[PDB]
Copies of this chain bind each other. A is one copy, B any other.
């Protein structure tokens, strides 16, 4: 049930061929881990591999090593508070959490051996036989985590802080985003259920409140982000993180901030490379868009105007062409994206994975919303643009076969409600099946398809089971939540119950993804991020586009429920987009004047640092001091200008100025 004090486990895959190099690589690996001070073990792993088991040996050297990371964080302004002057008394004040313990151990195996650590990384290709380094789960905590989170209706903030201490910050930012998303989704569930019942379908008032809500949630989350970044001591860790070994520096220069020499790429040289991202995103709209629009041009052909026999066996024909093609074009375009991402030559390891997401966001934008963009902007408002597209499928279906039995085409206005019932109800049930029921049972189905001490027998059988699992990507669950936020901000005016059935989903997904860490994947390495990352631009882009395309839908679709004026679309676009930009200013003005406990905790600790530095260095009666200098300047010039100084030495003290002051007032009154 409990681990044998193991922080990290290294797999070290050994093939039958090139074994002598793998033997020589083994003795180079195990010798390197003793230079950093890790007590090690070796056990029988899989059929051809050897799991080694490492832990930190001496706690007196480790507690000094954590203290340098505490001083190193406070040096670059990351930690808002300095540690105590006494060594290991600040460790008594705040103990070393499991996140900070596992992060520093992972550094000692991944530091590049120049300044510290032993460079055990798969990318260096000397340790090519090393598969992956991973920490072990604690089944005592994971059983207590899901049991505590299932009984409560809503999660307290101290529950997320329990996740930060165990699974790092980058995992804890997901649950802190999802809980702030699940609670803020009550508001468009409130009037959204009201706009479905009281108001009609496609109401302008709901599209104005949805655009108002999405900027309130986004600008409050940026305020809630800096409250957590200074609470967990993760304020601005983008400059901290260890640089990628593929960094191609032009020249080694001096860093003005740290005073320590760093590798430097010219930042304006990257921007001229970064402008290649714009033709990449434009080609991705053409590539993925032309797949979706013709598979939907086939889907409108089969279901409606094709009256041939057995269309239910033919209604599944276009969706097969999508699911065989939508990873194919994505597999091609991600191959171009990763070749483009190597060209931009990012410094830090997080910024390389961040810009990969920003390029992958264009693909996931097209594969999620182009079926809805085709319905609400081509099919239901216009329709007659599809008649050249519909006549093409009528021609080629005859060559597959008498005249093909067709019918006259009429625009069905219930398709936009029918497609939104799939994306918010049917897909979320399927996503609950394929993310929970599938990879849990497939892990048990792997158990059917398959010399040790009896005391460690169940433990080594547990760790060998844990090594087969895939490592957890927190970017994968961000993409499920941001794309779900796209359906609320953009297309929920068509189906105003979408915020309700997304609110029910997030209550499960906050516990479903919590279950996914425990039983479905190995424990991820406890990284640190100050923000959620590049999703803040993805949340802001869908919030702005959700102001335009929700006002365009309510104009184009409500006329079906007879000609629509072209300026009436452009005026309705211009007004609600300006209503978005106005209420973006008004909310950011109000939330600026609101009390922020994030920066106020920061600026107080910045102030009291300067007050402590000041006090250690510095540890009637005034009327004569005016006269005592007025007689001390006239003595040091009468030895020697004089027409200047005779203005001041005439009157000394206040009583000389009072009595000559009163004399001048009757001189001025009697002359008049």
Contacts and interface: CB of A to CB of B under 8 A. Distances in A.
Given A41-B651, A646-B455, A672-B16, A623 B257 contact: no
Interface stretch (A70-78, A198-206, A466-474): A70-78
Given A41-B651, A600-B257, A613 B614 contact: no
Interface stretch (A47-55, A158-166, A207-215, A407-415): A47-55
Interface stretch (A28-36, A280-288, A353-361, A389-397): A28-36
A57 B626 contact: yes
A409 B439 CA distance: 81
Interface string A563-594: 00111001101100000000000000010011
A331 B47 CA distance: 92
Contacts of A604: 256-257, 259
Nearest to A61: B625
Contacts of A664: 42, 44, 50
The 9 closest A-B pairs by CB, nearest first: A567-B567, A570-B570, A4-B647, A57-B626, A58-B629, A34-B654, A42-B661, A267-B593, A566-B567
A570 B566 CA distance: 10
Given A574-B573, A657-B41, A630 B57 contact: yes
Contact of A623 (B34, B44, B61): B34
Q: Quick one: copies of this chain in the complex?
A: 2
Nearest to A626: B57
B30 A626 contact: no
Contact of A654 (B40, B646, B648, B657): B40
A663 to B, nearest CB: 9
A26 B662 CA distance: 9
B668 A607 contact: no
B40 A607 contact: no
A5 B644 contact: yes
Nearest to A267: B593
A442 interface: no
A77 to B, nearest CB: 7
Contacts of A647: 4-5, 41, 53, 456
B4 A644 contact: yes
A61 B672 CA distance: 43
B27 A658 contact: yes
A81 to B, nearest CB: 12
B622 A35 contact: yes
A190 interface: no
A117 to B, nearest CB: 13
A387 interface: no
Determine the main DSSP class of A at the interface with B: helix
A533 interface: no
26 contacts: A2-B644, A27-B658, A27-B661, A31-B658, A35-B622, A36-B622, A37-B625, A37-B626, A38-B626, A39-B629, A40-B654, A42-B657, A42-B660, A58-B625, A58-B626, A61-B625, A82-B613, A257-B607, A268-B593, A268-B594, A565-B567, A566-B567, A574-B574, A609-B609, A609-B610, A609-B613
Contacts of A152: none
Contacts of A610: 74-75, 77, 82, 609
Contacts of A646: 455
Interface in A649-672: 650-651, 653-654, 657-658, 660-662, 664-665, 667-669, 672
A61 B626 CA distance: 10
B58 A668 contact: no
Interface in A518-549: none
A82 to B, nearest CB: 8
Interface string A52-67: 1101011101000000
A607 B76 contact: yes
A604 B259 CA distance: 8
Contacts of A140: none
A4 B641 CA distance: 9
Given A5-B648, A58-B625, A268-B594, 6 more contacts: A4-B644, A5-B644, A26-B665, A34-B653, A37-B622, A259-B607
